[PDB]
């Protein structure tokens, strides 16, 4: 029956999920009448903005929304943090490699956004999330040993019971380290990465065949097709689906993502060298022919970015597309680079000499943004969220220590200029000898730092000398300071000790502690990065960004006439036939009980 | 018996002397087995090369921008590389008070094209004896570049090799 | 071309090369010389653990612990 469950959500104990739902109902057990969609909204907020809703109101046991009673008690027991009542709920589920990973992601997000109470949300929720990660790894490593070829079918299907999302996206969205260190997921990712070409080709052979095209045709590269039809047909027959033909192999080789990565990175280095020669050697009053290629290149690059915005996902909503598109970080770097280039192109044909210089400065800053967009590929990760968690804390702690040091150096500067100089009527020398010189002093070497005598470069006989001379210290006798030099040295020793050692050692302690924690964190960072590369270099068309508009013409003409690429992603996400689905789920339920 | 090769042979003997003097140290330090060396030499050299590539990108960026903003187009290619890849590369190892070497006109000569005896072209001047670009922006940009290059990457290099 | 026929060293080699913790311990007491057999098994396990490459749940833990 319906609504027996609605009352079951009504009777939930005081929790952070209950506080969120109570905040939602504005716009204790047994009083309310909670509708299911009001739950379903917050469940989407915890699960991710990508997925479809779980509960359509008054459409129960009838936009897929299948009615599974196994996944209701498990979700109800997970969202209130019950260690021993979700373990009872888990064996009643239908598919248990998607359920455990969805529970792990919900628990880690709900443990993150708690804030106030950290006796519960740290220990209980992170330990329960690691528990369900370990359960999912155990079930999948039991399934992978028995068949090893159905497991890869199991990781890529669509489960309708968890918002039409695949298991692999739930696995890698929540940063599950031990599920991706497993061998089967890496074999599946390498099988995607290598594309049409068969594995075990060494690294140099791919680039050497990318240089010389008929070398691939000479049998130098093993392919998928030939090896598969050679082993499969023969092994089955001897113990007891078309042959690749004349001109198909060229498009089959050019459709691979691994080759496309190299043919994009080489064009990007060519772009950097072209911009480097244009910015320095010839930047004429009029735009020279060499500088036109730059503009044609950008036009192709902007059209490429517009196509990524269009057909990375199939959400069909303009808020739905742009809201996930701006949630990237590499796209942010690209958006800022293109905006700076457009502002430079506006300023660059001003025909007034005042703005001609400013435009060149803008292009130099745009070059810095492009050269950092290089390093973003090989080092940084895609996700916007986890960066802020450490950037904010470490920048805040750095700023507080830096403020603490700035106070001390201002104190030393104001006193040191206070004691030995007559009142100075010029304000620039005040700041230049009170904040600048003690700031530059503390980085200097201790024998070099002693630069103290009465009269070398200071001139003070008639007011102040204008050509870059500070006022002299006051003299009592001829060629002597009234203030002893050894007090200046003693005071410099105290200031030098306290500034040089005690604060900077604390700065080096914090930054080094993060650096050692970051470097000693894991060995699975590179493996995680591979998957970040795979998507963008998978979807992108084969031909390099000089000739990407040639691909845009075909793909734009095809887009409005008859629907092209009906499976937008056909090696990641698949919709299994209904007769196969039941036999697939029964096998993994058997393996779960056997586990 | 031809003077062209007499020098090259002496260079070859010097390299052979270096190989003999390393054959000394092989006895007392290194081990015999060929196999276990590659297991760590390959990984550490590969990680070193990747970090070094990551630093080289940054120093090329800083050099091309810094020479981009304050100099008129230079028709000589050797000064381009000599003041765009060489000087920012030598800068990051220098001490921070010594690293500030910035003023308009000491050794640059630019009045008639370029001076041939080892003089770079001058920065552009608006007034007499002034850079149109402020010196404190150059210092501010040098501080940002110096911080990011001096600390964050090299500490990662020292972290791996020391580990 | 010596090739002596020893039945003790056949079950031990057959049980070592498939990584059986509890069936090579039965096979070891049937051997004739047991200071050469254990060291040969240790070398075979360490080389076979090195050149695996793909799977490192088995080849690290099981093989290096059995070799030690
Ligand atoms: Ca993009």
Structure description:
This is part of a larger assembly, with 3 copies of chain A. Chain A has helices at 4-10, 16-24, 36-47, 70-78, 83-90, 98-112, 123-146, 151-154, 167-173, 177-180, 183-194, 203-211, 213-220, 224-239, 248-254, 257-280, 290-310, 318-325, 330-347, 353-378, 385-419, 427-441, 446-449, 485-519, 525-539, 548-561, 578-594; strands at residues 158-159, 165-166. Chain A has 27 helices and 2 strands. The longest helix of chain A is centred in the C-terminal third of the chain and has 35 residues, at 385-419. The relative contact order of chain A is 0.07. The first copy, chain A, is mainly α. In chain A, 64% of the residues lie in helices and 1% in strands. In chain A, helix 11 (183-194) runs parallel beside helix 25 (525-539) and helix 21 crosses helix 22. The complex binds calcium ion (CA). Residues 305, 308, 331, 334 of chain A line the site of calcium ion.
The amount of beta strand of chain A, in percent, is under 5%
Radius of gyration of chain A: 33 Å
Number of strands of chain A: 2
The ordered H/E elements of chain A are HHHHHHHHEEHHHHHHHHHHHHHHHHHHH
* Amino- and carboxy-terminal Cα gap of chain A: 33 Å
Number of helices of chain A: 27
Q: What small molecules accompany the polymer chains?
A: calcium ion
Q: What class do helices, strands and sheet pairing of chain A give?
A: mainly alpha
Shape of chain A: globular
What's the quaternary structure here? part of a larger assembly
Largest interface: A-B, 31 and 29 residues
Sheet with most strands: strand arrangement of chain A: 1-2
PDB class: transport protein
Keywords: transport protein
Entry title: Structure of TRPM2 ion channel receptor by single particle electron cryo-microscopy, ADPR/Ca2+ bound state
Chains A, B, C: Transient receptor potential cation channel, subfamily M, member 2
């Amino acid at each position: 029956r319906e609504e027996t469950l609605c009352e079951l959500y009504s009777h939930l104990p005081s929790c952070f999920f209950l506080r969120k739902l109570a905040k939602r109902v504005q716009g204790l057990p047994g009083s309310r009448k909670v509708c299911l969609s009001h739950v379903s909204e917050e469940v989407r907020h915890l699960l991710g903005s990508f997925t479809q809703p779980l509960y359509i109101a008054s459409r129960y046991k009838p936009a897929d929304t299948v009615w599974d009673p196994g996944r209701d008690l498990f979700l109800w027991a997970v969202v209130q943090n019950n260690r021993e009542l979700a373990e009872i709920g888990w064996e009643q589920c239908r598919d248990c490699i998607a359920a455990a990973l969805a529970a792990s992601k919900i628990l880690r997000k709900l443990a993150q956004e708690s804030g106030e109470d950290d006796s519960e949300e740290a220990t209980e929720m992170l330990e329960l999330a690691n528990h369900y990660e370990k359960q999912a790894i155990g079930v999948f490593s039991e399934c992978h040993s028995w068949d090893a070829q159905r497991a890869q079918k199991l990781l890529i299907r669509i489960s309708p019971s968890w918002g039409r999302s695949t298991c692999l996206w739930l696995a890698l969205e929540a940063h599950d380290k031990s599920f991706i260190a497993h061998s089967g997921v890496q074999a599946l990712l390498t099988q995607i990465w290598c594309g049409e070409l068969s594995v075990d080709n060494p690294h140099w052979k791919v680039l050497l065949c990318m240089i010389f095209f008929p070398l691939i045709y000479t049998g130098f590269l093993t392919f998928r097709r030939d090896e598969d039809i050679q082993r499969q047909a023969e092994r089955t027959q001897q113990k007891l689906l078309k042959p690749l033909n004349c001109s198909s192999r060229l498009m089959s080789f050019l459709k691979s993502p691994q080759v496309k990565f190299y043919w994009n990175i080489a064009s990007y280095f060519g772009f950097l060298w072209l911009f480097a020669v244009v910015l320095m050697i010839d930047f004429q009053t009029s735009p020279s022919w060499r500088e036109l290629l730059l503009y044609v290149w950008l036009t192709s690059l902007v059209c490429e970015e517009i196509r990524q915005l269009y057909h990375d996902f199939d959400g069909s909503g303009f808020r739905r597309k742009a809201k996930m598109y701006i949630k990237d970080l590499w796209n942010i770097l690209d958006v800022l680079s293109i905006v700076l280039f457009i502002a430079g192109l506006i300023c660059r044909l001003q025909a007034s000499d005042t703005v001609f210089y400013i435009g060149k400065v803008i292009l130099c800053i745009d070059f810095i943004i492009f050269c950092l967009r290089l390093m973003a590929i090989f080092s940084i990760s895609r996700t916007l969220g986890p960066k802020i968690i450490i950037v904010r804390r470490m920048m805040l702690d750095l700023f507080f220590f830096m403020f603490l040091l700035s106070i001390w150096v201002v104190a030393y500067g104001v006193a040191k200029q206070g004691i030995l100089i007559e009142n100075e009527e010029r304000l620039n020398w005040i700041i230049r000898g009170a904040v600048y010189e003690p700031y530059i002093t503390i980085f200097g070497n201790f024998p070099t730092n002693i630069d103290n005598t009465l009269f070398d470069i200071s001139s003070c006989s008639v007011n102040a000398s204008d050509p870059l001379k500070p006022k002299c210290p006051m003299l009592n006798a001829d060629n002597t300071p009234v203030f002893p030099e050894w007090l200046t040295i003693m005071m410099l020793c105290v200031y030098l000790l306290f500034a040089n050692i005690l604060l900077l050692n604390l700065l080096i302690a914090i930054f080094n502690y993060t650096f050692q924690e970051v470097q000693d964190n894991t060995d699975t960072i590179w493996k995680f990065q591979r998957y970040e590369l795979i998507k963008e270099y998978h979807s992108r068309p084969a031909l390099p960004p000089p000739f990407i508009l040639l691909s845009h013409l075909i793909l734009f003409i095809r887009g409005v006439f008859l629907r092209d690429l009906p499976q937008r992603h056909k090696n990641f996400r698949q919709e299994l036939e209904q007769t196969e689905e039941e036999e697939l789920l029964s096998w993994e339920a058997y393996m779960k009980d056997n586990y």
